[PDB]
Amino acid sequence: DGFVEVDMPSDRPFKQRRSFADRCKEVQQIRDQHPSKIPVIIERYKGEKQLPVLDKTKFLVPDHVNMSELVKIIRRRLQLNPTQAFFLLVNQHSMVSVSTPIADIYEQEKDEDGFLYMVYASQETF
């Protein structure tokens, strides 16, 4: 009766994989090396199945760009058709115009650890 050791890649959100201390320390280091860049965590929405999971979830973007540039980055990384539509929600369930500067979104919506959390989902998911 040996243990059937099962092991598989964790699908848990970034907040559950990295501790609060590690996340705070990481933003602190990043903002000290790159004071004009925003640390953004972009993950797949919890109820999304139509869109795949991206290999990368941590993004370091210039603080002079708008939400639009962030959509362009994710869209290309997802390799979407023009027929494929998706939303980019700040924190959770929160939607802003793509013309909105990310620096404005950051200072208003950033988590306590310093990261700005976003999720992507299909428009049909909601």
Query: What is the sign, positive or negative, of the torsion defined by CA atoms of 102, 108, 113, 117?
Result: negative
Residues of the domain holding 49: 14-122
User: How was this one solved?
Assistant: X-ray
| Strands 58-62, 37-44: pairing kind | antiparallel
Instruction: Please state the φ and ψ torsions of residue 116, each to the nearest 5 degrees.
Output: -100, 115
- 110's CB contacts (< 8 A; 6+ apart) are 116
Q: What is the full DSSP assignment across 57-86?
A: -EEEEETT-BHHHHHHHHHHHHT--TT--E
Q: How far apart are CA 43 and CA 51, in angstroms?
A: 11
Number of domains the chain contains:
1
Q: Which residues pair with 87 in a beta bridge?
A: 121
Q: Is residue 8 part of a domain?
A: no
Spatial neighbors of 122 by CB under 8 A, at least 6 apart, are 48, 50, 51, 84, 85, 86, 87
Distance from CA of residue 18 to its chain's centroid?
14
Residue 50 belongs to domain with CATH number: 3.10.20.90
Name the amino acid, one letter, at 41.
I
What is the distance between the alpha carbons of residues 67 and 100, in angstroms, rounded to a whole number?
6
The CA distance from 74 to 85, in Å, is 12
Q: How far apart are CA 36 and CA 32, in angstroms?
A: 9
Residue 80: inside a domain, yes or no? yes
Burial of 60 (0-12, 13-18, 19+ CB in 10 A): exposed
Q: Is residue 1 part of a domain?
A: no
Q: Of 57, 58, 71, which is closest to residue 102 (Cα–Cα)?
A: 71
